[PDB]
Design a protein around this nucleic acid. Sequence first.
RNA 1: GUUUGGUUCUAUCUAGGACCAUGAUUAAUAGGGACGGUCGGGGGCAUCAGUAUUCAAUUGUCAGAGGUGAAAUUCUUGGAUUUAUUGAAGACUAACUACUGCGAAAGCAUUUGCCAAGGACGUUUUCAUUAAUCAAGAACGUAGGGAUCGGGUGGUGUUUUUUUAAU
Lengths: 80, 134, 28, 55
Amino acid sequence: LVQDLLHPTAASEARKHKLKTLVQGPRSYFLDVKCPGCLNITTVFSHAQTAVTCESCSTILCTPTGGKAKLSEGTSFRRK
Amino acid sequence: KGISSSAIPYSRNAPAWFKLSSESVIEQIVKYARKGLTPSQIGVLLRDAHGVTQARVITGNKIMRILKSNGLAPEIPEDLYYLIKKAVSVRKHLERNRKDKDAKFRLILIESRIHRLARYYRTVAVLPPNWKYE
Amino acid sequence: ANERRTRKDMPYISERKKQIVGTVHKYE
Amino acid sequence: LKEDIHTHMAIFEQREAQAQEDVQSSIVDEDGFTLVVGKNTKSLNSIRKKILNKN
RNA sequence: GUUUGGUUCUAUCUAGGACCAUGAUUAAUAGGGACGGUCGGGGGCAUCAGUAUUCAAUUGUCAGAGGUGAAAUUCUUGGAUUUAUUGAAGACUAACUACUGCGAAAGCAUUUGCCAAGGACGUUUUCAUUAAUCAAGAACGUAGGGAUCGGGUGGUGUUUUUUUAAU
Ligand SMILES: [Zn+2]
């Protein structure tokens, strides 16, 4: 309602849009996933836009969706 | 209208969880280019293959200048070629069945939006002039 | 009240501590 | 056979439910990772043999 | 950044000559373009359906049927109206239908498929001012709050369910 138009509360900046803040920036994180077929690691975007495939055994990692892409139910991930 | 766009962050360097070299990204993008893929598709397949943000950040320059440096330049730019492809596709559909008056309207609009960009490209002279959409 | 009707980890934030968002020499 | 179906269902629903909650909260990997499970899937053996079948 | 061409100089490894295929930072909550899950009674072409309406055939029984404020005209024992079983024809899409959806506008409601297109969202993808405004021409004909539709994020209960895919 009535806040400082300089640096606001971190809850408020995480509340509002990623364009409407002071310094706009991303809200998609890069995450590393462990391929369950051959247990290696690869990097993948959050809003993945494409069915990414492992280089060792190209099974599947994430079917793309509109927003975040669904990780494919055997994969183990970590944010980074 | 509405806003829906990327928000490139405030940093301007490789995001330091990167564990990969610089010329390997160059080899990857010339490999996808010799496979025959358009630059925007190189950009998204590089966002998702190995964790780059974009090539102006991770390499020394943008993919258009790095592909002109590696000798795989496009003879016409991306938006020009894609509007030409959309124009010829809707022209082929209208010549399949001429009753589509909405496709006639959209062909007129795509012709206008491609002649605007052709005017820009001729006035900046990056394609050879006399180029006026056949 | 709607959001607290849903969620489970929501602190009853006191009005007398609503405005403080940071203190050097945190606690003794 | 009534006491047989009673005893067999009594141990089976117990082991099924504990396997279901065990795969529903199996968050920790030894190196940082979080296993994606999918909704209402009942077994780690089930997702393991599914990801073996999807090769 | 060439494919080759040719020279000599160490104890098969090396040195020094020439030809042959490239144009300044930021990425506007300015703009157009890619991509993705979608989204709509948006469009074009086929296709499917519904019971109506009219007409025809075949049954059935008998003096009226129609129409209006009253009538009248008309039709009717060669069976009008009504009933039942069908068959054909074109047009339209009852209820669902709302202060909801789409399209530049007029307008747009059955199903299914094809053909393209479009919008919003998502985006750490690309281009780098490409923008706006309209004669001529062209195609078609002051601030605040609640709710809802489309998309996305997070939460964590019921609907859901589980090794077939989907989400
Ligand atoms: Zn693997």
